[PDB]
Design a protein around this ligand. Structure first.
Ligand SMILES: Cc1nccn1-c1ccccc1N
Length: 147
């Protein structure tokens, strides 16, 4: 079939085939094109009441539900994909991570350093590709592979 991690899917609303990556939670209409020692990523984190540390520079007590966090992530993904908003702008304004002040940049990293779902998505993204919602003990991430 297609590159590993990817599967064919059917749009429930249009009937048109699309492609879904179960490692990055990315989805796209085009058939996907197709590992490095290190990747560089940015991310936009939305925490929730069950986050390992439910606090952030935005909010001393994060109280939103996981469902509310996922809805916020979904909305940010929509605006990034439509081009109304840039990833970096939304990360700076709304990421519950200290990296928000760096437009979400986390720098480069190897396997072994980040939380596993984040690492797997990061290394499965192509350069310049953005993830779907990625879930970790920290909360819910939108990941952008920059290198
Ligand atoms: C995938 C999903 N849909 C609604 C809520 N969540 C969710 C959010 C955070 C952690 C786990 C889960 N299941």
């Amino acid at each position: 079939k297609l590159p590993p991690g990817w599967e064919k899917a059917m749009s429930r609303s249009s009937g048109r085939v699309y492609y879904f990556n179960h490692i990055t939670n990315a989805s796209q209409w085009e058939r996907p094109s197709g590992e490095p020692a290190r990747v560089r990523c940015s991310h936009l984190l939305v925490k929730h009441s069950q986050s390992r540390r439910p606090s952030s520079w935005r909010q001393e007590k994060i109280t939103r539900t996981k469902e509310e966090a996922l809805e916020l992530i979904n909305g940010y993904i929509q605006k990034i994909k439509s081009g109304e908003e840039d990833f970096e702008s939304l990360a700076s304004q709304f990421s519950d991570c200290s990296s928000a002040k760096a437009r979400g940049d986390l720098g480069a990293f190897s396997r072994g350093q980040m939380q596993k779902p984040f690492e797997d998505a990061s290394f499965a993204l192509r350069t310049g590709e953005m993830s779907g919602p990625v879930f970790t003990d920290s909360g819910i991430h939108i990941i952008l592979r920059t290198e």
